[PDB]
Design a protein around this ligand. Structure first.
Ligand SMILES: *[C@@H]1O[C@H](CO)[C@@H](O)[C@H](O)[C@H]1NC(C)=O
Ligand SMILES: *[C@@H]1O[C@H](CO)[C@@H](O)[C@H](O)[C@H]1NC(C)=O
Lengths: 116, 318, 318, 116
C-alpha cells in the first residue's frame, strides 16, 4: 500500500550540509502531503517540514532559512536539504506520508543525523 | 399617534422573534455573568453582519464557528497552512459538523487581511479556490476580491457554502482553500493566522435545525393560486386605448400589474399569511420592480429610453 | 373595488412616465409603419432587460447602440478584432459619443456566445479586461463568467461603465476589450462577430440628458431632516424592559426602528414627495432590512442564532 | 518620429517561400498595431495581416494558413512569413504602423513580390 525508505543520513561537522531522501514504495497521491519529523533520543517526534498542493511548503521555525523540502512526484520521492547544520539538528529523522485523514499515518524507519 | 404605532411594532416583534425561533413561548434559562468562547461566536456573527453592511430565509439559523485548527509539532497532525510566494493553503477541520450536513444553509470564510506597509504593489486581486482531488482539474474557483495591500487591517469574508457543503458530505474531499494571487510579482496581501503565525481565520456555518425544517408573491404563485390575501394582480396598460397616447411607437402596451390584498397583523405562503417583517400596520406593496423600454418620437428624431420601476413582479406585506 | 384601484394605478402611470421623461404633457409626432436600425436599438435594450431578468435612478435614461465597426480591407482602418488561442481582442469606436461623456450613467457590453459542439472542455471561466496603455500594468480586470461552451447559443452582458467612461474622456485610452480564458487549454467559447467573421457584438450606452440632469429614506437623511412625510423613525427595543424577556443574553436590545409618514399620490427627497413607483394607494413601508444576531440559552446550552429582516434601515412609498 | 523600411522581397516560383521584414526607425509603442498591406499594380491597397496587444493577430482570408506575421518588439521589427506562394500574392507589399487614432497612418515605401 504505502511504504517509506529514508537514506542520506550520516555524521557531519557543524556548518556542513546533508541531503536526506525518502523513497515511497506503495501508492501515494500527488495531493497527499509528505514531510519530515525528527526525534532526538528519548525526546518525542518533532515536526520539521512538509510539502502539499502546488509544491507548497511548511517549515518548523528552527529550520527556516536552512532546510529545504522538495518532491519528485514522478518517482514519489521527497528530499530534505539540510544546510548550516547545527548540533540542535542531531536526531533520528523520519519521513511521513498522509494517510487516507489529515494526519501523518505512514512512517519510514528513519535515518540518523549527527552534527558535531 | 406614535403611541399604538410603536406598541403594535413592539408586539409584532415579540411574535416575530418567537415565530422565527419556532417557539410558542419564551424558554423559562440561566442569567450568568458566559464563556468567552461562546461570546466569540456571537461577536464574530455580529461583526460579519456589520462588515457586510458596510456596502428558510424566514426561520432563524443557528450559527457555529470553526477556527483554523491549532498545530502541535509533537502531534502527528498535518499543518493547517502551506505557503508559496503566489498563494496560501488553509484547511479547516469540519468533521464535527458532518452529522449536520443536511441542515447547512450558508457558510462564510472569514479571514483578517493585515496591513503590509512594505507591499510593493498597492492593489492586488486575490482569488479563493476550493482544492479538488485529482487526473482532473485540481481546483474550483469560488470568488475574488481586489484588496489594498498597504491599507489598514480589515476583515474579508467569502461565501463558501458549496465547498463546505461538499466537505461535510465527503471528508475525503476536504483539501482546504487556496488563497491565490490573480495572474492573467508575489502575493503581497498578508493574513492573520496564516502569515507571521483574536484575528484567527474561521468559518461561520449557518444551519436550519431539523425541527425547524419540518412561495414568493410573484406571478407563478399568485396567478395560479387566486386568493384575497396580498398577492400580485394582473394589469395591462394599452397606451392608445387607456391613455389616449399615440406618441409611443413601441411597445403598444405592457403588463405593469399591481399588488392588492389583505395583510394579516398576526397552497399557502407565509409571506402572505403572517407578518414576516413585523410591521405595525402591514400593507400590500410591491417588492421587486423591473424597468421598461420605450421607443417614441418628438418629430423626426427617434428616442429609445429606459424607465426604472415600471413593472411590478412580486409583492410583500409591509 | 378593483375599480378605482386599477384607474388610480393607470393614472399614476400616466404621470410617472411623463415625470420620468421630464415632460409636462405628451409630445404632439409621426405615426409611421420605422427604420430597422431604430428598432434594433429598442430590440436590444428590451432583450437585455429580458436576459438580466432571467436571474438618475428615477429619471429616464436615453439608450444608444454602438456596433462593432465593420472592417473594409481596402480602407486604412485597423481591424476591430485580434486573435490568440487564449483570448480575443475587440475594439469599439465610440468617438461619436465623446461630446456626451458627462451624461453617461451605465454601459453594457453585449456579445452572443455561439454554441461550440466541438468544445473539448464543457465549462470555461472567461474574463473581461480593459486594455491599458503602457511601463505599467497592461490591462484592468472588469468581470468574469462561467460559460457552458457546448450549450445552446446565448447572449452575455457585462457592465463596462468604467471602461467606456474612460474611453469617452480619453480617446487615446480606447485600446478595446480583451475576452480571455481564466488561467490560474485554449479558449473554447466562441462568439458571434468575433469568431467565424443580427448577433453583432455591441455596446449599450445609457445617458441622462443635460436637461434632465438639472436622498434615500434612511437614517442619514430622515434623522437629520425631520418631516411628516414617509421617513425612517427610531425605535429601540429593550428586551427586558419592553418585553419582560430575560432569556436573551446578547444583545440587551437593538434599534429595530420603523417607517411612518405621508405618501403623496401625486431638503426634500423625491422618493418622499412624489409617487415614484406609481402606486394606486401609496403606503410608507420598509425598503431595506437587516438581520439580527442573538445569544440565548435553553438551560446549559448556548445558542447563537441569526434572524432575518429584523432591523429597518430605509423606507419607500409604495 | 515614425519611419518604416521594408525588405526581403523578390521574384520566387509558385509554391516557394519568402520572408518580408519592416524595420521601424522612429518611436513606436508596443501597444501600437503594425501590419502589412499589398497593392497589385493599378489595384488598391489590400489588408493582409496585422499584430496587436499580446502578439494577437488578424489575417486576411486569402493568406490564412500560409502567411505568418510576427514582431520583435525589442528591435521594433515586424516580419511576414509567406509560404505556399501563389500568383495571386503578386503585388507591392507595404508595411504599416498605427498613428496617434485607430487607423494605419505610417507607411513604408514598399517591396515588390512576384510569384511565377
Ligand atoms: C465581544 O464584543 C464586545 C463588544 O465589542 C467586547 O467588549 C468583548 O470584549 C468581545 N468579547 C470577545 C470574546 O470577543
Ligand atoms: C424586433 O423584435 C420583434 C419582436 O421580436 C421582431 O418581430 C422584429 O423582427 C425585430 N426587429 C429587429 C430589427 O430586430
Amino acid at each position: 500500500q504505502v511504504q517509506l525508505q529514508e537514506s542520506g543520513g550520516g555524521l557531519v561537522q557543524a556548518g556542513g550540509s546533508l541531503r536526506l531522501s525518502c523513497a515511497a514504495s506503495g501508492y501515494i497521491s500527488n495531493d497527499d502531503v509528505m514531510g519530515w519529523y525528527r526525534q532526538a533520543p528519548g525526546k518525542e517526534r518533532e515536526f520539521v517540514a512538509a510539502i502539499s498542493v502546488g509544491a507548497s511548503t511548511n517549515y518548523a521555525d528552527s529550520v527556516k532559512g536552512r532546510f529545504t523540502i522538495s518532491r519528485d512526484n514522478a518517482k514519489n520521492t521527497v528530499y530534505l536539504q539540510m544546510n548550516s547544520l547545527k548540533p540542535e539538528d542531531t536526531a533520528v529523522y523520519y519521513c511521513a506520508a498522509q494517510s487516507e485523514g489529515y494526519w501523518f499515518g505512514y512512517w519510514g524507519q528513519g535515518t540518523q543525523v549527527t552534527v558535531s | 399617534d406614535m403611541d399604538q404605532f410603536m406598541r403594535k411594532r413592539i408586539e409584532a416583534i415579540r411574535g416575530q422573534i418567537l415565530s422565527k425561533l419556532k417557539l410558542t413561548s419564551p424558554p423559562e434559562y440561566p442569567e450568568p455573568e458566559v464563556p468567552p468562547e461562546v461570546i466569540s461566536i456571537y461577536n464574530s456573527t455580529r461583526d460579519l453582519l456589520q462588515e457586510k453592511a458596510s456596502r428558510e430565509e424566514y426561520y432563524a439559523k443557528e450559527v457555529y464557528k470553526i477556527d483554523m485548527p491549532p498545530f502541535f509539532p509533537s502531534e502527528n497532525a498535518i499543518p493547517p497552512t502551506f505557503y508559496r510566494p503566489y498563494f496560501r493553503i488553509v484547511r479547516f477541520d469540519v468533521s464535527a459538523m458532518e452529522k449536520r450536513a443536511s441542515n447547512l444553509v450558508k457558510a462564510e470564510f472569514r479571514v483578517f487581511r493585515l496591513q503590509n506597509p512594505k507591499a510593493r504593489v498597492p492593489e492586488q486581486r486575490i482569488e479563493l479556490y476550493q482544492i479538488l482531488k485529482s487526473t482532473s482539474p485540481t481546483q474550483r474557483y469560488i470568488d475574488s476580491k481586489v484588496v489594498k495591500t498597504r491599507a489598514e487591517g480589515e476583515w474579508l469574508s467569502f461565501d463558501v457554502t458549496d465547498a463546505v457543503h461538499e466537505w461535510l458530505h465527503h471528508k475525503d474531499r476536504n483539501l482546504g482553500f487556496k488563497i491565490s494571487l490573480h495572474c492573467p510579482e508575489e502575493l503581497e496581501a498578508r493574513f492573520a493566522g496564516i502569515d507571521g503565525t483574536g484575528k484567527t481565520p474561521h468559518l461561520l456555518l449557518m444551519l436550519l435545525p431539523s425541527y425547524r425544517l419540518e412561495g414568493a408573491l410573484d406571478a407563478a404563485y399568485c396567478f395560479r393560486n387566486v386568493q384575497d390575501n396580498c398577492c400580485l394582480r394582473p394589469l395591462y396598460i394599452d397606451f392608445k386605448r387607456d391613455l389616449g397616447w399615440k406618441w409611443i411607437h413601441e411597445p403598444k402596451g405592457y403588463n405593469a400589474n399591481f399588488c392588492a390584498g389583505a395583510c394579516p397583523y398576526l397552497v399557502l405562503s407565509l409571506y402572505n399569511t403572517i407578518n414576516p417583517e413585523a410591521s405595525a400596520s402591514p400593507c400590500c406593496v410591491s417588492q421587486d420592480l423591473e424597468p421598461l423600454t420605450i421607443l417614441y418620437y418628438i418629430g423626426k428624431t427617434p428616442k429609445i429610453e429606459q424607465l426604472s420601476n415600471m413593472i411590478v413582479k412580486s409583492c410583500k406585506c409591509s
